[PDB]
Amino acid sequence: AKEKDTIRTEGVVTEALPNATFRVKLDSGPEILAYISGKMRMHYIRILPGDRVVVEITPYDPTRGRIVYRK
Amino acid sequence: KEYLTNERIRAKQVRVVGPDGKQLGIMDTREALRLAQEMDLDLVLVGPNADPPVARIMDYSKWRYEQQMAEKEARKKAKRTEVKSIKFRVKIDEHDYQTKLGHIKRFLQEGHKVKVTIMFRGREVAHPELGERILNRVTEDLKDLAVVEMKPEMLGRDMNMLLAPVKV
Ligand SMILES: [Mg+2]
C-alpha cells in the first residue's frame, strides 16, 4: 500500500557511527540515526562526516532515517 | 681525527713539536723517529697538508683513546631528542585520542619534538576543518607543557604540526 509519509529532508553529516549508520544533523532540525540505503550500499559510496545528504524520515520516529542521496 | 704514525709518514722534513708544545724545528724524519724512540713516545702527523708537515711527539694510542672518550662522552650528552611523530584519522574517537594525547605528553616530558600528523585519503573538503579541530584541540590540551612551532599545514594527502616542549 505504501504510506506516502516518507519525508525527504536534507542534512549535514555529523558523526561516523558503526556499521553504515550516521548521526546526520538535518537542515530542518535534529540529528537522527540514519543508516545507509541499500542502493547506496550496492554502489559502494563511502559517506564521510561532513557531507550534504538527503534523509528518508518516518513521521512515527523522526529521530531515525535513511540516507537516500549521496552528496 | 684519523692520523698516521712513525713509519707510515711519507714526508722528509717534518715540523717537529714536543708533547708540551716545544718547537724542535723542521727536522728530517729519521732524527724525529729516533727522538720518539728515545722518549718512549711516537711521532704523529697532525697536519699532513701544511707548509713543512706538522709532526707532534705523543703516545698515539693513548691520544686516540682520549679523543674517543671526549667524543662519545660529549657527543651523546649533546645528542638530539629527534622527532616523535603521531598519526591520526579524521573520524577519530575518544579513548584512542586520549591515549595519543598521553603519548604526546610523555614525549614532551622526555624532551622530544612532536610531529602531529593526520593522514587523509580523499574528498579533501570536510578534511582540513576536522583535522584542524582535532590537532588544534590536542595542542590546546598540551598548552601547559607544549608550544606550537608549526601551524596547521597541508602536505598533499596529509596535515601536519610541530610541537616543541615548553621548557627543554
Ligand atoms: Mg515510511
Swiss-Prot record, chain A:
Pfam families noted in UniProt: eIF-1a
InterPro entries: NA-bd_OB-fold (IPR012340), RNA-binding_domain_S1_IF1 (IPR006196), TIF_IF1 (IPR004368)
Localization per record: Cytoplasm
KW RNA-binding (keyword) present: yes
UniProt entry tagged with the keyword Transcription regulation: no
Location of the S1-like domain: 1-71
PROSITE patterns (alphabetical): S1_IF1_TYPE (PS50832)
HAMAP family documented for this protein: IF_1
Subunit (UniProt): Binds to the 30S ribosomal subunit, contacting protein S12 and the 16S rRNA. Component of the 30S ribosomal translation pre-initiation complex which assembles on the 30S ribosome in the order IF-2 and IF-3, IF-1 and N-formylmethionyl-tRNA(fMet); mRNA recruitment can occur at any time during PIC assembly.
The protein, known as: Translation initiation factor IF-1
Annotated organism of origin: Thermus thermophilus (strain ATCC 27634 / DSM 579 / HB8)
UniProtKB/Swiss-Prot annotation, chain B:
Position of the signal peptide: none
TM annotation in the entry: none
Gene3D superfamilies reported in the protein's UniProt record: Translation initiation factor 3 (IF-3), C-terminal domain (3.30.110.10), Translation initiation factor 3 (IF-3), N-terminal domain (3.10.20.80)
GO terms of molecular function: ribosome binding; translation initiation factor activity
Glycoprotein listed as a keyword: no
Keywords from the UniProt entry: Cytoplasm, Initiation factor, Protein biosynthesis
First-listed, main subcellular location of the protein, grouped into a coarse class: cytoplasm
GO biological process: ribosome disassembly
GO CC terms of this entry: cytosol; membrane
Subcellular location per the Swiss-Prot or TrEMBL entry: Cytoplasm
Function: IF-3 binds to the 30S ribosomal subunit and shifts the equilibrium between 70S ribosomes and their 50S and 30S subunits in favor of the free subunits, thus enhancing the availability of 30S subunits on which protein synthesis initiation begins.
Assembly mode: Monomer. Binds to proteins S7, S11 and S18 of the small ribosomal subunit.
PANTHER family per the UniProt record, alphabetical: TRANSLATION INITIATION FACTOR IF-3, TRANSLATION INITIATION FACTOR IF-3, MITOCHONDRIAL
Similarity-based family: Belongs to the IF-3 family.
Name the UniProt record assigns to this protein: Translation initiation factor IF-3
